[PDB]
C-alpha cells in the first residue's frame, strides 16, 4: 500500500497496455564488442563469423560479447521488445552507464550496475550482481522490458499469444539505465522489435 | 520516363512531397576518416581529428563523404537534409558501385552520382564531372525527391515554400543510395524529421 | 617505486581513445578572465580582444596576465580535457590551486608554487612550475591534451596529433582542487576547448 | 634506524590495532570551554564555558584537554572521529607543555605536535612551523606512537589508512594524547566501539 | 633538355632565390571578394565586397587577383605564405586566361597550372585534369618558372625544400603569377625572403 | 661620487647625451638562426625561415638575441633603438662571457645581462632573472648610457625629450656588449643615426 501499487499493476498488464510505453531503440556502434556484429539499421545484434576490428573507444565492451542502447532512461515509463534465436546462448536487460566495459565482470548481470535475464539454450535465468535465479522454461522467442524510471521497478515478460512475467527487480536507480544485449552462440540473434 | 508526371512533380508543395517521406540512415562502414556521425547516424561532421574507422571496401578513403545505409530501384522517395548556412556539402544520390577510392570518388564527379554542391555561397549541380552554375538560395535545407518509376531526381529549395534548384531524367541501371558531402571546419548535413 | 610509480607509467602509455575514457567538458569561468581576454563560443575560445571586454571587477579576476580558469576544480578522480590552439603565437595551457595568487607577474602561469603549465613562446615550448623552467622538443601538433589525475597526483600534457606524445609531467600530491588555466599574449592568439568528436553528442 | 619507520608507514588499519590503547580524558586538564561526555570518551565545545575548578593541570588559555596517560616507551595507536567541517587539532605533547598563555596552543610550542583542520583545508604543526597537507574525506585520524624508536604518524583512516605526516624527534620526556577543538560545532570522539 | 630540368628539381632554397623577382598584386585583376593589403602584397577574403570599378581584365566569378608584370623569358622564383587550414590556389596563368564564368577558376583551364590547398587536401589542377599529391606542414609554396626551357616547379618550403609537382610545357605566351583564396579566413602573403638584402 | 655623477647624467638632455655617442653594429657570428640582419648591420627582424648561418661559439642556439661587435670596460657610451610599436623585444647590455646556449642565455635571465623587456605593453627591467616591473610609455625609441667608469648603466625611454625608464648601479667585472631581443612575428630592432 505504498507505489507498491503501481508495481503490482504493472507486473498485471497485457501486451497492448505495455504497448504504451514503447520506445524504439538503436544500438550504439561504440559500445559493440568485436564479436558482436550489427545489422538492420543497428537493430539486430548477432555473433559475427569472425571478430568486426572496431576501433577502440572507451564506450566499447573489450571482454563480453555485449552492446548497448544509445539512449537511457532516468525518468518515465519505456518497453521495448527483442526476439530471440531459439536454442542459443544469449541475454536482455539494462544497465548504469558506469557499469565497466572491460573485465569479466563486466559480463551483464555480473555485477550491481546490469540486471538481464539469460538463455544457456532452453534453461533460463534472472541475473543482477553474480547473484543467478532459475525460472520456469518458456517456448517464447520474445522478451519484453519494462523500465519504471518513475517508481523504480524494472520487469521482464515473455510474450506469446499473451505476456506472463519472468522477472522483476525494484531498485533505487542511481543513475540512467540503457537497453543491454549479450550473445555468445555462433547462432545467437537479438532483434529490436519495430512495429 | 513520362513527361507530364515530371510537371506534376515540380508544382508539388512540401506537404504533397512528404507523402513520399523516407526515413534515411548514414551507413557507419562508408563514412570517411574525418566525417563523424551523430543524433542516431542523423548527422555527419567534418572531424579534424581522425577517427580510426575500422577498414572497409565500402569506406570512403579520399572524400569526406558517406551513405545511406538503404537504397531504391523502384517507388517514390522524399528526404531532406538540413545544412550549416556558410559552408562547402553537397546532397545528392549515387549507385553503390561509384568508386570509393580518389578524387574520381568526389559526388557529381564520376557516371554513378548526381548532387547539389554548396561552396560557401556558389551553388553547383554534378553529374559526370560537368557542373551546372545555379542561383544562390537563403536556404539551409534541400529536399531530395527521387522518382526511380519515371526514372527523375529533383533538388528543392525549402524554405517557407519550396523552389526547384534542378533535376536529373535518367534510366537508372541500379539501385540509388542518399549520399552526403561534407568539407570544411564545421560542416554539418542533418537528415530531417 | 610499486603503486604511485605503476599506475603513472599506464597513464603514460595511454592512446588518445584511452586518455578520452577521462573526458570533461570544461567551460571558460567569465568571472576569471582578464580585460584584454575575449570568451566566445559558449565560454569555450579565449582570444585577445585589441580592447577590453570591461567585465565586472571580481577578486577571482587576473588584473595582470592574459589568464582565465576554467568554471569548476578537481581534488579527486581522473580527468582528461584537449586546448586546440593557432599555430605560431603566445599562449599556454596549466592548471591551479584557487589559491593563486591573481595579481601581479608572479601571477604568470607556472611562475609560482600555485600553478603548472606548458607554453608556447616565440616557437619554442617550456613546462613551468614554481617559476622553473624546462625547455621542450618543438611539436607540429596544435593541440594539448591534459590527464589531471586526483587520486594518485600526478599531471600530464601530451601532444595530441594522429598519435598522442609526451610533452611534460608533474608528481605532485595536490594540497586542494586544480582548475584549468590558460594563457593567450598575442594580438592574434586563441585556445579553443575541443569537444571530441571521437564521443557521442 | 629508518627501516622501522619505512614498516610502520606500510601498515595496514588491523597491523595498527596491533598497538591499540584506551584514551580517557583527564577532566583536570580540559579548558573551561571544552565539555566532556560518554565517559570522558568526547571533547566538544560547550555552548557557553564550564567554570571547572582551577587546578595546576588545566589549560587556561586554550581549548584544549588530554588523556590521563602518557608514554615513554613502546608502540601505541589510537583513533579520533572528527565533524568534517570545523576547527580541530590532534595531536601529542610532553607533560611539561605550559598550561598559559597563547604559547600553550597545540603545536605553536617544541613541547606538542599534531594535525589541525581549519574546516576542508589540514595542517601538520610543530614549534608553530605550519605545514600544508593533502585534504581528504576521512573523519578519522589514526595516532601511531612509537617512543622506543621516537617518531610520531598520523594516519587518515578511511576504508584504507593514508599518511597525513610523522616526526621523527628523539622525544625528552613522556607523550600525553592532546585535542584542540575550536568552532561551536568540532567534535573529537575517541574510537572503541 | 631533361637534364636541365634534374638540376632545379635538385636545387636548395639558396640556390631557388638565385631567380627572385618582386610580384606585387595587379589591384585591376582582383575579384569585388578579394581585398589586397602590405602595398598589393597580401590578398584575402574581404567581409564586404570592396567595390572595385568594373574592368575586362577583372575575374567577375572566382575569388582570383594576378601579378602586375608576366615573363615571356628567363627564370623567376617567388614565395607565397599561405595560412593552414583554408581553400587556396597559387598558380600561374596565360594573359589571355578567361576572367568569367566557373572555367575561369585556376587549373580548370589550359591557360594555368596550379596548386590547390582543399582544406587538408593538397592537388595539381591543369586543364581541368586534377593530380593528387601527399600532405606537406610547409605553409609556404615557391614557384621556379623556367621561360627559356619550358617548365614550372612548385616546391614545398619549410626548413629543407621539397617536390610538390611540376609540368612541362613549351608556353605560347607571358605567365602572370596567379592566386585563389575563399574561406572566411584565406589569405596569401607574397614573401619578401630576409635571405636577401634590405638596404 | 657615483651618485653625484649619477644624478648628473640623470639631468641631460637628448643633445648633451650625444656627446657620449658610439656607432653600433650588429655582430653576425651572434645572430640567431631566425634572426635577420638589414640596413648596413643596422637592423635585427625575426625570420620565418632559417638563415642557415654556420656554427659559432660566440652564436645564441635558443635565444632570439644578436649582439654588437664591440664592447666597453672604459669610458661613457650612449646608443638608441627604436622599436616597433606592439612587439616582444629587449635592448641591454652583457658580458662576453654570458651563455649563447638555453633558457638562461635570455637577456636579464643571467647575472651576465642587463636589459629591459617589452612584453607587446608590459615593460620590464630584468636582471639575474629578477623582474622589475615598469610603468608604460608611448615612447618607441629607447636610449642606453652605460658609465664603465663609475659603473652604472640607465635605460632612457626617448621621445619629444627623455625619460628614465630605470637604471643599474653595478660594479662591472668586465667588458659591456650591446644586446638585442626580437622574439615575435615582424618584431624589428633599429640602432639609430644621427
Known amino acids: 500500500s505504498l507505489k507498491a501499487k503501481v508495481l503490482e499493476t504493472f507486473l498485471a498488464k497485457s501486451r497492448p497496455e505495455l504497448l504504451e510505453y514503447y520506445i524504439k531503440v538503436i544500438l550504439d556502434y561504440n559500445t559493440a564488442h568485436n564479436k558482436v ?6 537493430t539486430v545484434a548477432s555473433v559475427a563469423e569472425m571478430p568486426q576490428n572496431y576501433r ?12 548497448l542502447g544509445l539512449h537511457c532512461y532516468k525518468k518515465g515509463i519505456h518497453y521495448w521488445e527483442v526476439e530471440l534465436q531459439k536454442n542459443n546462448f544469449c541475454g536482455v536487460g539494462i544497465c548504469y552507464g558506469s557499469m565497466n566495459r572491460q573485465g569479466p565482470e563486466s559480463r551483464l548481470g ?10 544457456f539454450n532452453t534453461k533460463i535465468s534472472a541475473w543482477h550482481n553474480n547473484v543467478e535465479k532459475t525460472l520456469p522454461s ?4 520474445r522478451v519484453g522490458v519494462l523500465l519504471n524510471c518513475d517508481h523504480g521497478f524494472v520487469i521482464f515478460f515473455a510474450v506469446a499469444d499473451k505476456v506472463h512475467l519472468m522477472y522483476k527487480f525494484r531498485v533505487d536507480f542511481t543513475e540512467a539505465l540503457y537497453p543491454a544485449f549479450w550473445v555468445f552462440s555462433a547462432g545467437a540473434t537479438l532483434s529490436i522489435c519495430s512495429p
Open 110 to 119: 555480473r555485477n550491481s550496475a546490469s540486471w538481464c535475464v539469460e538463455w
Open 138 to 141: 518458456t517456448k517464447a522467442t
Open 56 to 67: 577502440p573507444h572507451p564506450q566499447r565492451f573489450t571482454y563480453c560479447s555485449q552492446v
Open 37 to 42: 556484429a550489427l545489422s538492420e539499421c543497428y
